[PDB]
Design a protein around this ligand. Sequence first.
Ligand SMILES: Nc1ncnc2c1ncn2[C@@H]1O[C@H](COP(=O)(O)OP(=O)(O)OP(=O)(O)O)[C@@H](O)[C@H]1O
Ligand SMILES: [Zn+2]
Length: 359
Amino acid sequence: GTGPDKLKKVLDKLRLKRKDISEAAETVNKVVERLLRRMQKRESEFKGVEQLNTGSYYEHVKISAPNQFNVMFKLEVPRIELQEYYETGAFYLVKFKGNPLSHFLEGEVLSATKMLSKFRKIIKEEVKEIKDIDVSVEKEKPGSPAVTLLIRNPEEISVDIILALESKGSWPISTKEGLPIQGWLGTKVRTNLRREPFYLVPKNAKDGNSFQGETWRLSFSHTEKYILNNHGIEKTCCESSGAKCCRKECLKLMKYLLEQLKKEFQELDAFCSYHVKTAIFHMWTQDPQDSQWDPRNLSSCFDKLLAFFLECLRTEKLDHYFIPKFNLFSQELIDRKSKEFLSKKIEYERNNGFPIFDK
Ligand SMILES: Nc1ncnc2c1ncn2[C@@H]1O[C@H](COP(=O)(O)OP(=O)(O)OP(=O)(O)O)[C@@H](O)[C@H]1O
Ligand SMILES: [Zn+2]
């Protein structure tokens, strides 16, 4: 009946949804592994592709939609020269310092359009050879770089395949002051994480253009998975020989709150789960102690995350955790109107016992 007990009940409800999600993921993994084997056997620019096992499913925070999965295929690309397209670090053009990708160049710039067109062509050919699972490729949607598989098991599962370039060079200068984990996971962890590769994912800017179509966004999905699964100041946080915290529980509740609100109000189309993830990264930095995230504090921790998110909405400021000058809540990206509408809705739920969770 009480507020704290109701929030625990929501987490139970989310726990129950994970069984269908896990079962669907087994089918997705079967298909993805079959497709990757075919891609690794075929001679092409994409022969070196591998699954990057990142994203909400592998972070254990996929809370809904067992019929929709996102999968990343990484391709190592040596000697990438990056050019900032936005000096905030929001977008990059890829250039090079013979080139295996030389067929995808528009002058000196790597064409995401050309490279994705061949990627899609090959995936479509190889998926047709998968004879023992019912799987097809969804017709291409303009503005959507994903190559989407449709699996029927017998129910339909959609799998968005995202091509990600992997660079082993040092991280871009736009990330210099990002990943501010020094007081939480520490300086040794930060140094080790920044020695890992980084990824580039195709994404159109839509603006004055010229090179619209050929821009890429940075991706740190591997780092984010590491942080989600190694999220405590104590190394034993949430391990068998350690103490549970409520960090991931707060993430799941806030993701669910946003997902429920977005279902009801098309005014919220501009918001996405990555805004919640980015906000909770900042909150984990602000409140680094595991004791601040004791399971008994679930309700007060969720409330302080809501308060922090409301402050980001009010100030129209939510910095990308890895790229500090990239403001995800800029007036340019999300109307002041949309932020005020979401602030009103979150405040309502907060002061009335979260009726949208009852749905
Ligand atoms: N607007 C965005 N800006 C930057 N990265 C984004 C954005 N939207 C999604 N991502 C990327 O999505 C990755 C997470 O993949 P995932 O499969 O969890 O997709 P999702 O749509 O964010 O998740 P969910 O289905 O749980 O809501 C993150 O590593 C992040 O880099
Ligand atoms: Zn923990």
